[PDB]
């Protein structure tokens with residue numbers, strides 16, 4: 001009997017509980033359940049991924065087509081907070097991948113630094129994502145930008161980081177809480193405005209979705225970055 005199967009997305013597993021392979025067996029990050037499966041000499045541990053805490057988990061359970069975060073990927077994560085979702089991104093990309101965890105709160109930054117002591121593939125970048133010139137010497141070109149900064153100017157922030165760091169043909173995944181971007185606009189008006197702005201920066205959405213029943217008026221937009229020469 002197989003208990004934990006690979007998900008459609010490489011590096012994600014499904015146990016309906018979503019889980020990732022724990023890069024640091026024995027350690028939990030935010031109190032999540034861990035499931036360790038031993039058979040003979042083999043052993044693998046997974047970590048439960050809470051879709052009421054992690055917008056990316058809610059999107060995956062909501063049926064997103066691609067997430068682009070995969071084993072070996074280099075990810076620029078904007079708005080890393082204390083590392084809840086970053087820890088699962090770190091699990092997915094694995095030892096040969098890389099996650100830059102950009103977060104400007106020093107309080108949250110201390111949690112990220114402690115998390116990255118055990119995870120070799122996390123670089124805490126405790127800086128303001130509006131000013132990538134201050135950290136551009138730390139960020140090698142990346143494959144994916146994941147953004148969840150919950151700011152009215154999030155699209156401009158993401159575009160500036162994309163134009164600096166994202167490879168041609170790389171991808172983006174942007175989390176959008178409508179009332180964090182413009183609380184006097186309707187969710188549809190916010191999401192349409194943000195999609196429009198992305199397209200103008202050669203961030204072409206390939207999929208957009210909302211996150212019910214985990215979150216209300218909260219979208220995830222996934223797409224590809226195809227800038228001019």
Ligand SMILES: C[S@@+](CC[C@H](N)C(=O)[O-])C[C@H]1O[C@@H](n2cnc3c(N)ncnc32)[C@H](O)[C@@H]1O
Pocket residue numbers: 053054055078079080081082083084085086102103104105108127128129130148149150151
């Ligand atoms: C919704 S929380 C992120 C939750 C996190 N993505 C997760 O799922 O684990 C938004 C975060 O973005 C951070 N943030 C907001 N504006 C920022 C900026 N200009 N630069 C860096 N971090 C920023 C906030 O401090 C906060 O930690």
